[PDB]
Each structure stands twice: as structure tokens, then as C-alpha cells.
Write a protein that binds this ligand. Sequence first.
Ligand SMILES: Cc1cc2nc3c(=O)[nH]c(=O)nc-3n(C[C@H](O)[C@H](O)[C@H](O)COP(=O)(O)OP(=O)(O)OC[C@H]3O[C@@H](n4cnc5c(N)ncnc54)[C@H](O)[C@@H]3O)c2cc1C
Ligand SMILES: Cc1cc2nc3c(=O)[nH]c(=O)nc-3n(C[C@H](O)[C@H](O)[C@H](O)COP(=O)(O)OP(=O)(O)OC[C@H]3O[C@@H](n4cnc5c(N)ncnc54)[C@H](O)[C@@H]3O)c2cc1C
Lengths: 588, 586
Amino acid sequence: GNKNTPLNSGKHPDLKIEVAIIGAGTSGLYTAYRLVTDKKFKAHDVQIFDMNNKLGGRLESVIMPGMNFWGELGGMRYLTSQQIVTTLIEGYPLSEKDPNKRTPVLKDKMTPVPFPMGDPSKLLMYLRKERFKQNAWNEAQKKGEKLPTRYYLNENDLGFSSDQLFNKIIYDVLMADPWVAETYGSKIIKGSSVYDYSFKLTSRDWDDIKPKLVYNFPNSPYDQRKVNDIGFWNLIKDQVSQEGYEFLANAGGYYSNTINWNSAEAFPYMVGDFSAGTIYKTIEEGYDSIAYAVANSYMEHEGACIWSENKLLTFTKDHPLTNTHKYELTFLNLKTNTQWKVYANSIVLAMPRKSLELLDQNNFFFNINKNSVLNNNIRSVIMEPAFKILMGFEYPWWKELGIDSGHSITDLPMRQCYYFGTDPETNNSMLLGSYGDMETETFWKALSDDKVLFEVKAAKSASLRELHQLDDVQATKLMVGELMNQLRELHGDTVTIPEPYVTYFKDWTDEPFGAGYHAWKAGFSVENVMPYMRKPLTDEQIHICGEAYSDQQGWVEGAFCEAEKMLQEYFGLDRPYWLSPDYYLGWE
Amino acid sequence: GNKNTPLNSGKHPDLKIEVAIIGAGTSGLYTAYRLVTDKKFKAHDVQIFDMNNKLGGRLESVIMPGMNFWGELGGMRYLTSQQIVTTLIEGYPLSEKDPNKRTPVLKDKMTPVPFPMGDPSKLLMYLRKERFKQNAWNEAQKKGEKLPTRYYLNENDLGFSSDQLFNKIIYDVLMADPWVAETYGSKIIKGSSVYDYSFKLTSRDWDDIKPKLVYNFPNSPYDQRKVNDIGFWNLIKDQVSQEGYEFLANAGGYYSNTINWNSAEAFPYMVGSAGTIYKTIEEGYDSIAYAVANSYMEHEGACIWSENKLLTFTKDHPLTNTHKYELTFLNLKTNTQWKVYANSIVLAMPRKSLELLDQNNFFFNINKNSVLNNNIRSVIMEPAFKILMGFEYPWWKELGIDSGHSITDLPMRQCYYFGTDPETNNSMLLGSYGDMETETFWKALSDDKVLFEVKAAKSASLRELHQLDDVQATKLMVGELMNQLRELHGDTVTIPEPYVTYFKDWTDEPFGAGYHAWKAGFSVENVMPYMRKPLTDEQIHICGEAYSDQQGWVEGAFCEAEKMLQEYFGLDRPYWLSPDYYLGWE
Ligand SMILES: Cc1cc2nc3c(=O)[nH]c(=O)nc-3n(C[C@H](O)[C@H](O)[C@H](O)COP(=O)(O)OP(=O)(O)OC[C@H]3O[C@@H](n4cnc5c(N)ncnc54)[C@H](O)[C@@H]3O)c2cc1C
Ligand SMILES: Cc1cc2nc3c(=O)[nH]c(=O)nc-3n(C[C@H](O)[C@H](O)[C@H](O)COP(=O)(O)OP(=O)(O)OC[C@H]3O[C@@H](n4cnc5c(N)ncnc54)[C@H](O)[C@@H]3O)c2cc1C
């Protein structure tokens, strides 16, 4: 099938090429695909290297025995307003509604499906031991009530849901800047209902606002500072009190980023880049199918090669072949523990902050004594931890509360569970747990570090034969134990929860990732850092791309967009023919 | 005065000695002091090296203009049951009550004083917007009430204070182990009041219990596991619910460690006696570091090399006939490297300091010394930040607050009302945060470039105050701390702006932490003796607070150094130290 893309765990000592791409994630794969498809180099002269035994980086889809559908260890969904990932998956143009009348860009067949949001009638919000339905705030407001909670909000914020309060905070901040309220008042909209705030601000509008927006609150410790220079927890507490911050931080799930990051960058991240008709979708064959579709398109050019289980150690300008090649790269061939040299004229580091820090810091590129600016910009983002646990049950116990799909949210350390689906033949049913924020990394770490692993157990269409293949990826007994205990407290006593037969634990804080996703720090010029990272030194053909230093952090689109900007800026490529000239990219 | 201990910022290329001590913190200073006082080596053959421009490491006392008394940036107090730091400060024996009838161990004069605890009638607990007095739980229980709070406790725990609930948790866990309830039931005591739990477990009893204690709770995810293998947040939630954990985590400040660290190690850390009190040193707590440094330095040839940073060390060098090890130092004043030759290396330095050394040498090499690397990572680096703030008057006295500290779930977490100059009335507050993600709340503010501007006050000229320009907190941090201090105390007291601040971030290199905490699942009884000499064929030792069993204390640093000294440097117990003070296995 399409996910058997060949991977070379071998080596070719003294390989000579033009472009070394390090990282077979979304950005690396897309760089390789674009360079060869546009004939900028022959396939043999553009090679990808990865230390992993798979392509896709933070996309990793899995089929667990007994359950014939894809679980997601990493990314799961896209937005149709994200035009690179959307066009590459669905084909062009995006104006055609008939998928049959669309021209595919990539050969691999990918079945787009809507991403289940579920029923807010049946999905749980479990905060300070109070079990609400997610529609509790809506239901209350229809009866003209202000829903009481065990958070002590400011009086003027009482009855607001988390969504409504964020919308209010962002409205209040934008409209206190005279220049913003005047220049964009049209697209910053107070409705008639006290809880009704909407935004029509485009990605390009946000690019105008973010660097200029001033925090205009006369008694605030943060008065007259760029909102850029204010952490998001700082700003949310200043606006709705620390009890307000506890409500918003605890009542948001994976998508909702309430760490103390760049408030200016946080605003668009929370209200969107305007919308109508855009929905969340995934790929029936698993979301990592998009990585395999780009890899396979690159690999259909003979000479193309993904080197797997090959780890970049270091690179230097001081080597025997400076007549043909500016750079010598050293790789560790993990299978053999043998080092080998590669010669290249361009290096693309398609890899996140932690991956950059794990490279030899003593070389000409990273040297702190020389490149203090590089090192400051590498540290311009927060490494956010993310963990995923997939759990297979003999039946979907959640259906007893009328839950089909979607996710429950709680201030318990588990934070979130997605009811991910039921094999209609075996009835075997998948849950995924997603935690990491509000110190929950430290709650779970002790349990995930324990040595005694969960034992697989036979179930419908899942033999011990098949399940012992996943022995080494099982969650720990203590983690499964405590997650079962928290799932019982979350759902309540009315529903029996059986033990799972199979688990799959993934820790994205593991090297070389060191993070699920990244978040701009307060006080950095993001408009200046991004173009800098795409080529840090004026006299070196070394580029950084991927999600970490994108302005769409937490998304494949971020990784594709930084690669695309890098390609137009330094590799002489035009916008792809399949990409609308009106999709907004950046300054260039 | 006693704090002008000479420091050599220079270098001596190819210096040849026996024992290189890296770190002029409490453990390094005490190693040097013990080796020369017991004449194990001549003072020229035992040298201390530090990258800082002062000795004392995580002890740093300061006098700020306008206020004639010592502020503490780092450690502030000791317990009289901590027998090394207590004897070194006060002299021997510890049974004598008259300080005049005591024999000093060190020449420097140090004035012991009680550490002000304050009045729980007047000190604040501000949790989820409810302002209690710290005695609210006691007062309620006297009127036979169960004090209500905005934490939703299990019903069987309602009305308990944070102290009472911890005591209950620890009682319940110990008594569920048949072997413990039977072997130590005598010293694990339920009173008649529902809230009354006390302990008489000694350090030696805890060393017996910690490695064996089993968690006996049949429906628990953690049932039949060593308590050693359970994180403390894990254990507290299993015992009093996640809302119970929120209560205990938020209502502790004062040396209350509720991170997800080793539960077995956490138990003694929480219940601790009688007659033992908290004390400080009137001349500032770093005086104990200066007293040990000065005692070492009164031996001819003794030297603290300051602003000299260890980079690396190797067995592959030109002088292996006289010296097993060549050390390379960065002379920070010149940015030049120089070699030192030695037969023993003592790394008197915490986890982050070890990690900042050249990891590629024979010692740290991960490909060979995987157990060293695992054990270096056996402890959590707990962040700590301190902000001293000088006010023209003690605004806190208006609420009848003399002294002690208020606690809150606001990000500021804790303020100590540290004292008032009786002549100028200038009054010092210290803010202490870092836990419960408060590191990330404050970091954005502390990293901002625009610094708080000093302002003249009684007996504090701009002349004197501009000397501290570069250590002022940021305007944003002072701004937000003032905002949180007003919400903490309430509207009944006006709080003026400070005239001076002093910001200290202990997460800065090379410290990387205020203090350390054993992780769950490590054999601490086996890691400690390992860290004091990791490789059987190398004379390289680690000592200090980080891998002690009294983390967060000078006593931990002294005790690991003392064990290291008796184990590998052929020293006897000091004559001034009681043979009955329990040290470890050896
Ligand atoms: C839990 C989770 C949920 C997510 N949800 C979504 C979502 O719903 N939708 C979405 O669009 N995005 C989502 N994302 C992001 C998505 O996973 C993207 O792939 C991600 O944004 C990163 O792609 P990238 O090119 O930056 O590289 P990465 O995926 O970070 O790839 C980096 C690669 O570099 C390799 N590498 C690093 N160092 C070296 C070295 N020295 N030598 C060799 N190889 C090296 C690594 O092995 C890896 O393969 C999610 C991420 C996570 C973790
Ligand atoms: C906020 C705070 C409050 C505290 N409160 C108390 C308290 O009230 N009472 C109490 O008893 N204890 C307290 N402690 C602990 C106390 O400060 C002790 O000093 C501490 O426990 C550690 O002493 P140490 O020997 O481990 O070394 P450290 O104090 O960590 O000294 C290490 C030294 O090594 C040096 N160094 C590191 N790397 C290198 C290198 N490569 N080359 C050269 N030099 C290097 C550093 O410059 C430093 O001087 C507190 C700690 C903090 C942070």
C-alpha cells in the first residue's frame, strides 16, 4: 500500500549531492517534493535524511489489532482554509465542490472526511468536581440565566462560557487601541446579546495588527506596552482575574493554548483567520497519509532517496572537497554505529527547536561566541509538551451516555479524552487521552517512567500473536491504572468502564522532538524572526523550516508554509500552479 | 569585616595540587575546611575554584541602602536538629543552653537569632479569592465547626487544615503497611481529636521505612507498589482527590514541596523534635559560608580561585607520572584557558552545574557511563526566584503584621515581611515564587528589558542606590507584584511604591534550580553513595545539596560532603559532632 515508501537504513560514504534535507517531517518531504517536481535539481542531488525508522515526524497514524481504522499518535485534522495541506489532500481548485471534478496534485488516494465534533448535549466538562454538559452555558443563557460554576469570576464576566469570555477579552483589548478600533472596527463586532463577540479579521489584517497593537488599560501594570510584549497568562489574569485564568486554562482542550506565550500571536490563534464554510477534516487512511503522499511523489523520481535511521551529528566548511561542495555532513548510521560523510552545497534543517539544540553546538553555524543572534532566535519559542495514549476496549462504553464521537474536557490531570471510534464488525472501540499542560506532564511522567508495562489481553479479532507485536509501546500499568481511575471519576458511577485489551503510548517530549508544538515567546519580533530562521547567516546556504518557527504553530500548514517561503526566497521557485495566488503567505 | 574573604580572579598556569574542589558553595568550602583542619593535606595541595565573583553559592546575603539589616537572596534559616550547621554556627556541645559556655568550632563570630514565625491571627491565606487568617482552621475547630473553603474536598476530609490533612495522609499510608504499623505503631500516633496526628519517627526510622514501605489501598491504581515508586501528586490525589491536591499544593509555601517527586522521600520532608526551632544569623545566613571559608583560608597556601570556570578534565595529559587528572579552567577576566593538575576532583555543585561541564570527556561520556547519566537525572531541578523590595515604611503593620509570611494561589505565591530599620523605618518585603507554573507567569516579566528605576528615601541617596541599578527587578514585574500585593491584602491598606528592589533568579546558570527533589522510582539509599564516587577506578566525587537526603538545606550539602570525607578521604567524625547524629549507611 501507500505507506510502504522505501526507507534506506544503509549508508553511502562520501555521497555528493546539492541539497541535504535533514528531517522527513512535513516540511522536509515538501521541500524535496517541490525541488525535484520543478526540476530545480535532479532527484539524485536532493536527498532526505532522518534518524527515525519512519517518515512523517509528528504525523504518525497506527492500526491496532482488533480495530480496523486509523488511530492518531500525532496530528489528526486540517482546516480547509489551510490551502497547501487542503489542496495537496483534495486537489484543485478549492472553488470546485465536486471532489470528482477536482484535479489531484499527488497520486496517492486520500479520502477526506469531516472531523467529528460530537454532541455538546452528551460531552462532559468536569471542573472542580462539577460535571456539566458542554452546552450548559448555552442552555442557561437561553433561559436568560447566568450559569454558576466553582470559579469566582469578576461580576461583569459571570455566566460567560470559555469561548465567549476569550472573544470578550480579545474584543476589549483590540478596541482600546484607537488605531485598531478605527482601522478595523468594521471587522471587530459586538452583537446585541451581552455574550456575542465575532471577528472577520483576515490573516493579512492580523499581520498588520500584531506588531503595532498597544495595551490601553490605564491602571494596568502592562498599560502602553505592545500586546506583543505581554505573556498570555499575564494578559488573561489582568483582564478576568487569576480565577478567570483558571477557568479559561482548565476549560480549554489541546487546541486552546493558555500558556504564558506571545499574546499578539495568541489572539488570531484563538478566534481564527476568518472562516465561513471552513470545517475540520481528516483522512480516512490516517492523517500521516499526507506525509506519505508527498514522500511517494518525491520518490517516483528515480535517484530520490529517504535515508532512515541516519542521524546528523555535525557539519563543517573545513573538509577535503571544498572545490565541489561548501559543506561536509557527518551522519551516525544507527543500525551499525558507524559514521559517514555527505557533501552538499545547501543544508535544509526541516526540524524543531529541540532537534537544532541536539546538533553539534561547537561548529561554525551554532557557535554561541560568534552567532549569539542565531542562538537567541532558536530560543524565541516555547517547547510545549504533548503526550497521547490510545486505548482499545471490547465495546464503546461511552455510548451508554449517548456519546458517539468528540471529546470530554476536565481539570483532572488526564485533561481530555477523544471517543475516537468503533469497528462496526468487532465492536472494539478506541479512546485517546491527550494531556501535558498545567504541569500535567509532571503528574504523568512518574507513571510513564515506571518499568512495569501494561500486558495485552486477547479480544475480538485480536490474537495475543498480533498484540505482542505492540508489547514495547504499551503504556505502563500505573498510567493505565490511574487513567482508568480518572475516566471513572470523569464519567461518573452510572457507567461501568471495562479494562482495555491494548494501549499505545506516545511521548512527543522524547528526543529529537522535545515538544508536541511550539509557541512564540512575548517580546520577540516574530515578523523579523521567521525570515531570519529561513536563512540565518547571509553567507551560508543553510535554512531552517518546519512548524516550530512558523506563524501557524501546532499545524502541518505552518510547516508547509515556512518551507514554501524558503523555496520562493532562496530556491528560485514560483508559487505552485495548484496554489491560489490569493492565499496569503508572508512578507518575503 | 568577615565577608572580605580574599578571592583570586587570576590564574597559575600548570598549578600542581592533590585535591581540586570545584564549587565554593557550602559543600566545597566544608570539604576544603575539613581536609586542611585534619591535616590530611597541606593547604597549598587543596584548592577551591568557582566561576562566581563571590563564595557561598546559594547562600547570598545583601544590605540594601536605607535598611541596616541583612536581606537573603538565597537560603535564610536552619533547624537546631541539623547538627553540622548548628554546631558550626553556635559551637558545642548542643546540650549547653548558655551561648557563653559553648566552645566555638570556627573563629568568625556569628549571632544566632530566632527566625520570626509571626502571628497566625494576622497572616493571610488568599485562596480562590477568599481571604482567610492562617488560624481560620484552628478557630473554627475550637467552636466545633468544619471551616468551609472553595476547595471541594472528600467529605471525610472537610474542615482539615493543610498541615492536618498532610499528617492524616501520611498516617493513613504508613498504618496500611502491616510491617510499619507493627514495627513503628508506637511512633505513629492518632490523637483523640479527629484532626490530631503526630509522629516520633527519627531520621534512622525513616531510613528503615522509605525503601520497604508498600502502598496498601485495594482499589488504588498504585496498590501494592513501594511508596518510593509513586510521585507525591499521584499519591496526594489518590488519597484526598485532585481538589484535595489543589488545596494542599496552593496552601503550602514555607518549604512545602508538593511537586510530583518521590513520595517516600516526601513523607519525612513534611512531618520533620520538640525544643528544635528555626534560627538565622544576625550578620546574614551566608556568614556560615564565610566562617568556613575564613577557617580554610587561615592555613598558609589556601586559596579560593574566583571567576575561574571548570570547562573539562582528562586522564590524557603530559604529567600522568605525578597527577591522574588535568583540569582546564576559563579565566573569565581574560577569556584565557589554563591547566590545573590533581589526583582527586570534588564536584561540589548541583545537577545543572554537572550538565554544563564537557559531557564528551571520559567521566561524563554517555556511551560508557550510562548509570552516571541516569543518576545525574535522578532529581528534579525546582526553580526558585526571590525579589527583595524596600518600602519607606512597613505598610503591613496596619493589619498588625510584624513578621512571618502570607500565602496565596496568586502567581506571587508568598511574601515574607522581613523587617523594619528602627531608625529610618525603611522596611523589606521578599516575594518567593516558582512552583505551580508561576516560573512561566513571571519569566515574560523578568525577561523584559526596562528595569525598575531606584528612588531616593530616608538614609538612601541615589549615589548608593545606582550601585544596584543592574539587579533591579523589571518595571513590569514590580508593577504586577504591586497589583497582586494589593489584591492579597485587600482595599483597607494603601501600599506605596518601593524605592529599591533586588531580583535573584536561581534558575540562572550554573545553578539551574533553587533546590532539588528525588524522583519516584530511584533507590535513593543506592544513588547517594554512588554520587559520592561514581566510578570505582576514579578519584572523582560529587557532593552538595542536590543528591543529599536533606534537599533544600545547607545540612544536606554538609552531610554529603562529610560522608564523602569519611568514605574516601580517611577522616574521622569531627570531635565537635555527636557520635549519635545519624549520617547514613557509609
Ligand atoms: C499531539 C500533536 C497534535 C497535532 N495536531 C495537529 C493537527 O491536528 N493538525 C495539524 O495540522 N498539525 C498538528 N500537529 C503538528 C503536525 O504534527 C506537524 O507535522 C508538525 O507541525 C511538524 O512538521 P515539521 O516539518 O515541522 O517536522 P517534524 O514532524 O518535527 O519532523 C522533524 C523530523 O526531523 C528528524 N530529525 C531531527 N533531528 C534529526 C537529526 N539530527 N538527524 C536526522 N533526523 C533528525 C526527526 O526524526 C523528525 O522525523 C500536531 C502535533 C502533535 C505532536
Ligand atoms: C531560594 C533558596 C532558599 C533556600 N533556603 C534555605 C534555607 O532557608 N535554609 C537552608 O539551610 N538552605 C536553604 N537553601 C539551600 C542552601 O542555599 C544551600 O547552599 C544549597 O542547599 C547548596 O549548597 P552546595 O554545596 O550544594 O552548592 P551551591 O550553593 O549550589 O554552589 C555551587 C557552586 O559551584 C559553582 N560552579 C558550578 N559550576 C561550576 C564550574 N563549571 N566551574 C566553577 N564553579 C562552578 C557555582 O558558581 C557555585 O558557587 C535554599 C536555597 C535557595 C535557592
